Amino acid sequence: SGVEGAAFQSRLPHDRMTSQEAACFPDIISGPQQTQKVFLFIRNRTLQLWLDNPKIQLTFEATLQQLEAPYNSDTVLVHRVHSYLERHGLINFGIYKRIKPLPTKKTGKVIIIGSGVSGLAAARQLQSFGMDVTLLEARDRVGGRVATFRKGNYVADLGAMVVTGLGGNPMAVVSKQVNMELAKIKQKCPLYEANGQAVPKEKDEMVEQEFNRLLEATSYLSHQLDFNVLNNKPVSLGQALEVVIQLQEKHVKDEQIEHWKKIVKTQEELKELLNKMVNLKEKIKELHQQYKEASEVKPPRDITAEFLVKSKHRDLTALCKEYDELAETQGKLEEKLQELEANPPSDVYLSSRDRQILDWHFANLEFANATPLSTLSLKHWDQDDDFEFTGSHLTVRNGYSCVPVALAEGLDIKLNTAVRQVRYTASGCEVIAVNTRSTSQTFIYKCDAVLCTLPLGVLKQQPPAVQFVPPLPEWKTSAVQRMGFGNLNKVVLCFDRVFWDPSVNLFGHVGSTTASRGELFLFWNLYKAPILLALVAGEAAGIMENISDDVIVGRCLAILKGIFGSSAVPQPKETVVSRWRADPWARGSYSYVAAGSSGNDYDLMAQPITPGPSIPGAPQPIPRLFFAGEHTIRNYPATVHGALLSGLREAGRIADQFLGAMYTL
């Protein structure tokens, strides 16, 4: 690591200029190789400096201070580099001590819809760049899809929960800036069938291995066999898995068929030999009689009578020779049949008990993608894989909300303000919002640009919950309908005493049917207090929303009783149940690559909108409407860090637009 490790931590190749860098420094990247390596060093070093101390602002001066020759010889290059990094939120982002107090007077006015992480992140950035920033939040709280339940000492995240490894995670920086209590998750997850009996390590390891092998198989189907369109429709992951399983059941049968068919060839070969043997014993029976009769003719006898005895003696031993060579053959074939019938091929591909545990592994995947596997795009469901972080996944032990709240400090946030209409024209924007409490109480907001961090579920609403004037262009609205917005729910169970294995972080429950594989399939022990957290995933998630809390808490205890003892499970003091699809400010949990979509749609979502000219024949206008949010970041969708980065991204773009890019020259 060191200089090179900082580039990795900032999600950048240490020894190559990015496309964004090619854009801002076209003089360098087109120029000689020597210059490029100097550029790259300056970049990497500046990042290192910022990362090593992320709680204070890193100024141009401080950066130049700690450089060597010939890296500090060119001060305009260093300044361009520093400014580029600062603009695009690679350095001086989040919550840090400011050296030069905020600029005396502001430039430009920006309305940000929603104070989710993406919103807040961008807000802080723009305010850092000296812009007038006001966020409009429909909820009575910040954070949005980052929600944390708090009551007494009970702390449990109903929204975002896991930091998916620190290796290249911008949340690594944030966690140093905010008092986040990050605790690692222990991999092991013991399973328990419907009865309450633990799945033995025999089955457990077998099914899981088969699960992973089934996934690889679908990948093979997609890329190598190009099985992606079936009857004009795009093939889902669900379809692909069924197809693979069926082909694996087909093989199990094919094996048996040509094994028994192998027996009948040997069995029928024996049939033919036994016939030859019986027909020979018939001739031997008759020949012995003839020889006997010939020997009863007592001597002296003429030569023909002597010859008869000898002839029949020769003819018999010759036929007795054959029969013994056939009893030889019989012996070999007889045990060759005991060979084949001793070791048959697999009876079944998977039993009912097996297929149920496999459904749990599917449910786990349905949780991860927050959607039934029949909706995920086979080809693209995992497109964001290459950009996955290193390090073990962690949980915010003191509640994730600590992060949005900390980001929200020093920002103009209008809570309980539901945006109803967004108006954007060549000369500017007006945002029409109402008070959520008295919905007849109206607000108008005027701004140079609108940053829209509305969830994809919201953008999907029909009839629309937010109106765009003029209407969003066809290419944008298509991208909204194509993309998948999933669902995933959490059940918070607060007890007074820990009745589970304290060294076990998570344990599964296997449902009875495929239909209900997602229903309460997983439990979390993560926090200080005795809190267990139950997940509702897949198809089950959407249906469980129409069921009342008591019943859900019922099924929860029922299951927990089955695993720990019908008496060892007390009544829960506090219970909370999420309903994200029902939540009007979410309309679901987070995005997924739906069948018929791709990673490209995420880029489309990020592309800003530019209004038509006021006066016809007037010049091409500035872009006015911008989009950030978890569903706009192709390489980090459906996460916090994704949102966080999408925020930083738009901020940089908006600041470039309205304050001007001073660093490109």
Binding site: V162, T164, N369
Partner: peptide, 6 residues
């Protein structure tokens, strides 16, 4: 996405 897998 993929990364949420247990």
């Amino acid at each position: 996405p993929k990364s949420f897998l247990v």
